[PDB]
Design a binder for this molecule. Structure first.
Ligand SMILES: *[C@@H]1O[C@H](CO)[C@@H](O[C@@H]2O[C@H](CO)[C@@H](O[C@@H]3O[C@H](CO)[C@@H](O)[C@H](O)[C@@H]3O)[C@H](O)[C@H]2NC(C)=O)[C@H](O)[C@H]1NC(C)=O
Ligand SMILES: *[C@@H]1O[C@H](CO)[C@@H](O[C@@H]2O[C@H](CO)[C@@H](O[C@@H]3O[C@H](CO)[C@@H](O)[C@H](O)[C@@H]3O)[C@H](O)[C@H]2NC(C)=O)[C@H](O)[C@H]1NC(C)=O
Lengths: 949, 258
């Protein structure tokens, strides 16, 4: 069936990380565009269309990061990790050309060295070790040590086409040593010693210009040092009088040199960074300096070469411009508009054809990085493509001259997703009309009759209009966003760690709205929750978002709309210390909304929707709400509770030794979960009652000490109501990543054994006896009993990156467990297979009722593969949302890409069967009538003939 | 109320099944009428039947008859010298029913095996729709009927109230059992359950399986019966009143002559 419906109601969107090292070479340039991002993934985009041709993902915990990336005519070279493994890739195809291992050093810089004709070797300089490898094949022959390496920092390695390799060594505050070697064999020629007390950094700063000219700025005395590595003896200090001498007080000055690798020689032009934004192109001939084109604003600049001519692109904030403290605004209609202009490098000419103008929509984002791809065409036309990078995470491409400046934009901030939720659609016009027409407060019989008559008349008019439309025929999604009989299209909100809110649809998958936060630093805690639903009219939907930091300790709450995007005019303030925890109260008040309260570090309850009836209901509840807090470093499990109005009191306390055990993860019970059957059939006919706990938390603790044999891992089951451990399970030979999922009454946690290289699967289930309790009111104050705990063991030959369970509204269908694999395919397996009631020896009644003999051998069937073709490179998490029919769950797997589908728990029992031929049914239906009418006359004539004869 | 269903499964299953069973019953009735064939009746058997009717009528209505003529009839029937039933003897067929075997056969034959053809129809209908949910029955049911009721849905938590198309049509068969006679009449032969079972008034009521034995049985039955002249009691009308002849004589004026 899956082959027939390839892409009917599923979609996958592939993304990549933030662009770090992107090049815009390939003079032929059919569609190739290489990008190496900061998440250990190297991708290739298309200039024309924009799709991904070939991408590769190695790592992403802490190793395999890209450090440097060089580019030859057809072959690309890059170094991963920190100087251990280096592999070279291709652009015409996708794969590995060659690989090379390095020694144990600290990667600082690499470059290309050409013997006499072209590049034959690459030079890699580490903290102390210096090496040189081949570019075509992989061979290490040139490797040697430097004179002084301990108190010496080597950076900014420059190479010449003559055949001499130069190396610059600048210590933080002392002297400077420039060394040089040959290219044929390792031979130290001579060493230059120069004293410079104001030379502090050299990694990114000083550049090489002209032909071995070292130029360095100095804001202390506001001067320039120029020295010759090739010839001369010492440096020559140059004062800054011919141009405007304006160096920022608290700013280190930067140089922007450029030297084409294919060309043995270099250029004599370079940009100087001044203050926040002050660039100036100047040329150094021998001792005289010519400055021209004193750029006033020049927010960003870029260099480019195509042939013997050099181009410099300048990005300015122009469109009525009004410059603020650091940002730039344009007061005409759209605001935040920028222009790109081309300039000559040899002279200071400005092209009259190159004039790019584009504006952004969101406010706050500013350009960060930009590349330029000039190419010669025709005879007297210069064409170039600019790729401006948005401040947070976004890519954009511009054309030279067309109808629209923006060609393709890819959202690169949709990779790292922290929290995600799904909300429904408001209503349908006819449905809303019917709901409003039914609404009656107090009326008599005559009134209801009149209303019914009016509704009937409206229905008749609608039917007449419909029939007219049929007779005639016989002869923006944001605006509509209507619902249907089975709600399958839902609006999902995604939150990025960067701080961007994305609203995408479930059916199509197009970006509807996207909002930006003022400022979000890395590793921030996010939490989204929906208070007001969309089923009602009287007030717009309300969605709240909590965000807190780690370093400073700031907590903020936002109240926005998940349907449109505009935020409401209601927001409480936050004071004291950052918000610790939040809880959603099921009781509703005010109009149709839920009440939210938060706990401060001063142990106080703050209510979000301040309302007299809200506080009255909260006070009437009083000793009914409990709060448990969990600590990892402190290792202290606390329980507080509300008393009378608003105050904490310690009720139950637990402590765990941090040195022995360590807290890792804590899962609980979902709020939206309903259990249909409260008992289970047993061998003969007897009922068995279960043990359902709405208030029960599970703690997973591991061992701090890691050894081959000594490994401690266990699960604690504690009630949040009263401190009382139900069951404490412990293993002895398990370690590594452990995943725990909690369900109706069964816990599923997986581990890895060191004694035997395998992954063991433990299923825990809680069961009561044959007699039931009160069974009308459940409370944890009472119920002084201990439920039976059942454990079983299985084998799963995989890693299980993610695990989730399909959750349905009523809970009548089966309970499938979705498991992700490192490959990317997601497999769904039934819970019945992993049942604790698996008899070892085949028993008569056991095999008679419903049971399969126990066998610890779980194989991965290829038929039970939801992901047939579309795969997820990194499965961070999977979210399952219950649909509305009965047996339909929407599964969305997030991570490096996005993919959405529908999972069928047990085939289908709510929708009409697909293979249902109506021709046969209609033919039979008509033939029955035809045969009845045929036989009627036969019977009549038979009766008449029998009577007469 | 749960398990929200589509509006396309009710218009493509319920109505088709209802019309299917309705027209199947009607077609069966019409074909049963068409296939009915007359049985040949021989003159001697006809005469035997008429003599039997005459003797039975004598047995029933014998009070309002003269005693002399009644004894003449009874002698003509009995007549120890010649005897009509005694002399007139036709061919005899060897029998086979026996006391205990037939006493048991009265129940053994019955109508036990007349449900299978309807089961065939239900099986075909269920084969057409494998995984389907037609309707729910308000009547609470026990979980031991779920295998017979659902028969194609893999659900153990679901209640047995939700029925499949098989039981839906099965209940549809007997729902119109008393409705078929409403349009046809008292003598209806549209019963879908009893397909092979012949249900009719019955051609040739008289069935003289053994003419001689029936003759002897009627001969002894007519000897047993007595005579009680119900005419001898005429005094009851003697002392009475005559007011009904005044009765419609009033209402016989009102009609004129056409
Ligand atoms: C099972 O749990 C339920 C709920 O806890 C118990 O029903 C509740 O029982 C209490 C105590 O008998 C009732 O409180 C009553 O309050 C009135 C005043 O409102 C007072 O006059 C009585 O003396 C009594 O204290 C409460 O109304 C009742 N709730 C309901 C909904 O009936 C039930 O007794 C428990 N059953 C067992 C076997 O433990
Ligand atoms: C996994 O995805 C690949 C694509 O990357 C599938 O190969 C392509 O599959 C599509 C249909 O899924 C083929 O399209 C077909 O084209 C013919 C005309 O050429 C048309 O008559 C068909 O109706 C259909 O549209 C496409 O040709 C095919 N491409 C190749 C190179 O084979 C692949 O089948 C997928 N794997 C599966 C389905 O197991």
């Amino acid at each position: 069936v899956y082959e027939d419906q390839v892409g009917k109601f599923d979609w996958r969107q592939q993304y990549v990380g933030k662009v770090k090292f992107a090049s815009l070479e390939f003079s032929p340039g059919s569609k190739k565009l290489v990008v190496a991002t900061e998440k250990n993934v190297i991708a290739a985009l298309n200039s024309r269309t924009g799709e991904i041709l070939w991408r590769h993902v190695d790592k992403g915990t802490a190793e395999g990061a890209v450090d440097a990336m060089l580019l030859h005519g057809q072959d690309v070279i890059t170094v991963s990790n920190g100087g251990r493994i280096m592999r070279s890739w291709e652009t015409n195809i996708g794969g590995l050309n060659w690989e090379i291992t390095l020694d144990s050093g600290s990667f600082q810089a690499l470059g290309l060295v050409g013997l006499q004709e072209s590049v034959r070797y690459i030079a890699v300089l580490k903290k102390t070790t210096l090496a040189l490898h081949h570019l075509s094949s992989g061979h290490l022959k040139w490797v040697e040590h430097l004179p002084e390496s301990d108190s010496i920092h080597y950076q900014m390695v420059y190479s010449y086409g003559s055949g001499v390799v130069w190396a610059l060594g600048v210590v933080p505050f002392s002297h400077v040593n420039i060394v040089k070697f040959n290219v044929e064999d390792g031979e130290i020629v001579q060493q230059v010693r120069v004293s410079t007390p104001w030379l502090q950094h050299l990694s990114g700063a000083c550049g090489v210009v002209d032909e071995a000219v070292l130029v360095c700025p100095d804001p202390s005395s506001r001067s320039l040092q120029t020295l010759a590595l090739e010839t001369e003896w010492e440096l020559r200090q140059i004062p800054l009088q011919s141009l405007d001498l304006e160096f920022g007080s608290g700013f280190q000055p930067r140089v922007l040199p450029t030297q084409p690798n294919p060309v043995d020689a270099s250029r004599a032009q370079f940009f100087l960074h001044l203050s926040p934004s002050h660039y100036a192109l100047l040329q150094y001939h021998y001792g005289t300096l010519s400055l021209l084109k004193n750029f006033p604003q020049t927010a960003l600049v870029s260099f480019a070469t195509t042939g013997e001519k050099t181009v410099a692109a300048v990005m300015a904030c122009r469109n009525s411009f009004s410059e603020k403290s650091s940002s730039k605004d344009s007061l005409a209609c759209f605001n935040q508009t920028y222009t790109i202009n081309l300039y000559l490098v040899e002279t200071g000419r400005r092209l009259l054809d190159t004039t790019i103008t584009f504006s952004l929509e969101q406010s706050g984002t500013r350009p960060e990085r930009l590349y330029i791809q000039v190419f010669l065409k025709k005879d007297d036309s210069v064409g170039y493509r600019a790729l401006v990078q948005t401040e947070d995470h976004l890519l954009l491409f511009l054309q030279q001259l067309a109808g629209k400046v923006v060609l393709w934009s890819r959202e690169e901030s949709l990779a790292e997703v922290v929290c995600l939720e799904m909300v429904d659609l408001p209503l349908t016009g006819a449905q809303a009309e019917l709901e409003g027409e039914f609404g009656k407060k107090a009326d008599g019989l005559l009134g209801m009759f009149l209303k019914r008559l009016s509704s009937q008349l409206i229905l008749l008019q609608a039917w007449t209009s419909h029939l007219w439309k049929m007779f005639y025929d016989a002869r923006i999604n944001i605006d509509t966003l209507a619902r249907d009989e089975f709600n399958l299209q839902k609006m999902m909100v995604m939150v990025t760690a960067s701080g961007k809110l994305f609203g995408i649809e479930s059916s199509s998958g197009t970006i509807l709205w996207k909002q930006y936060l003022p400022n979000v630093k890395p590793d921030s805690s996010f939490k989204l929750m929906v208070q007001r639903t969309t089923a009602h009219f009287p007030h717009p939907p309300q969605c709240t978002l909590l965000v807190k930091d780690k370093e400073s300790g700031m907590s903020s709450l936002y109240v926005f709309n998940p349907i449109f995007g505009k935020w409401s005019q209601v927001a409480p303030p936050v004071l004291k210390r950052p918000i610790l925890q939040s809880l959603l109260l099921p009781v509703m008040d005010q109009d149709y909304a839920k009440v939210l309260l938060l706990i401060d570090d001063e142990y106080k309850v703050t209510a979000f929707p301040a309302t007299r009836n809200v506080l009255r209901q909260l006070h009437e509840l009083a000793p009914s709400i409990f709060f448990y807090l969990v600590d990892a470093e402190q290792g202290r499990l606390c329980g507080y509770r509300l008393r009378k109005d608003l105050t904490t009191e310690l009720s139950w306390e637990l402590t765990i030794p941090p040195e022995v055990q360590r807290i890792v993860k804590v899962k609980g019970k979902r709020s939206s979960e309903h259990v249909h059957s409260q008992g289970r059939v047993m061998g003969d006919r007897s009922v068995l009652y279960k043990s359902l706990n709405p208030n029960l938390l599970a703690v997973v603790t591991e061992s701090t000490d890691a050894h081959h044999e000594r490994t401690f891992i266990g699960i604690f089951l504690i009630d949040g109501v009263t401190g009382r451990i139900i069951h404490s399970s412990v293993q002895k030979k398990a370690k590594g990543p452990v995943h725990i999922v909690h369900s109706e009454n069964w816990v599923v946690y997986q581990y890895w054994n060191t004694k035997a290289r395998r992954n063991e699967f433990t299923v825990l289930e809680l069961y009561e006896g044959t007699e039931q309790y009160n069974a009308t009111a459940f409370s944890s104050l009472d119920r002084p009993q201990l439920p039976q705990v059942l454990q079983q063991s299985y084998i799963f030959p995989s890693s299980i990156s993610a695990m989730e369970a399909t959750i349905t509204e009523r809970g009548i269908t089966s309970r499938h467990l979705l498991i992700g694999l490192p490959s990317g395919a997601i497999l769904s397996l039934p819970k019945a297979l992993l049942d604790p009631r698996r008899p070892e020896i085949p028993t008569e009644q056991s095999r008679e009722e419903n049971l399969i003999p126990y066998s610890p051998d779980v194989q991965i069937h290829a038929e039970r593969f939801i992901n047939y073709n579309q795969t997820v490179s990194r499965m961070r998490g999977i979210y399952t949302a219950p649909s509305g029919l009965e047996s339909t769950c929407l599964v969305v797997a997030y991570g490096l890409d996005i993919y959405q589908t529908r999972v069928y728990p047990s085939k289908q029992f709510d929708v009409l069967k697909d293979d249902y031929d109506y021709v046969l049914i209609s033919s039979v239906l008509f033939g029955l009538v035809f045969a009845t009418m045929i036989t009627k006359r036969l019977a009549q004539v038979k009766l008449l003939n029998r009577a007469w004869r | 109320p749960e398990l929200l269903l589509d509006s396309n499964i009710r218009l493509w299953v319920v109505l088709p099944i209802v019309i299917i069973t309705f027209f199947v019953g009607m077609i069966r009735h019409y074909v049963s009428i068409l296939l009915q064939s007359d049985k040949k009746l021989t003159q001697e058997q006809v005469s035997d039947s008429q003599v039997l009717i005459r003797s039975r009528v004598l047995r029933e209505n014998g009070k309002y008859i003269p005693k002399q003529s009644f004894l003449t009839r009874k002698y003509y029937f009995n007549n120890p010298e010649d005897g009509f039933f005694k002399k007139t003897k036709r061919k005899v067929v060897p029998p086979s029913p026996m006391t205990d075997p037939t006493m048991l056969t009265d129940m053994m034959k019955g109508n036990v095996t007349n449900v299978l053809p309807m089961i065939l129809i239900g099986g075909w209908i269920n084969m057409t729709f494998s995984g389907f949910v037609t309707t729910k029955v308000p009547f609470p049911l026990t979980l031991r009927f779920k295998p017979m009721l659902q028969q194609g849905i893999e659900l153990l938590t679901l209640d047995a109230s939700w029925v499949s198309s098989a039981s839906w049509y099965f209940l549809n068969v007997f729902g119109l059992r008393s409705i078929y006679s409403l349009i046809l009449g008292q003598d209806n032969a549209a019963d879908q359950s009893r397909m092979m079972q012949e249900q009719m008034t019955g051609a040739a009521m008289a069935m003289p399986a053994d003419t001689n034995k029936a003759f002897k049985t009627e001969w002894e039955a007519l000897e047993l019966t007595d005579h009680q002249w119900a005419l001898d009691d005429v005094e009851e009308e003697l002392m009475a009143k005559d007011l009904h002849f005044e009765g419609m004589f009033k209402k016989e004026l009102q009609t004129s002559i056409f």
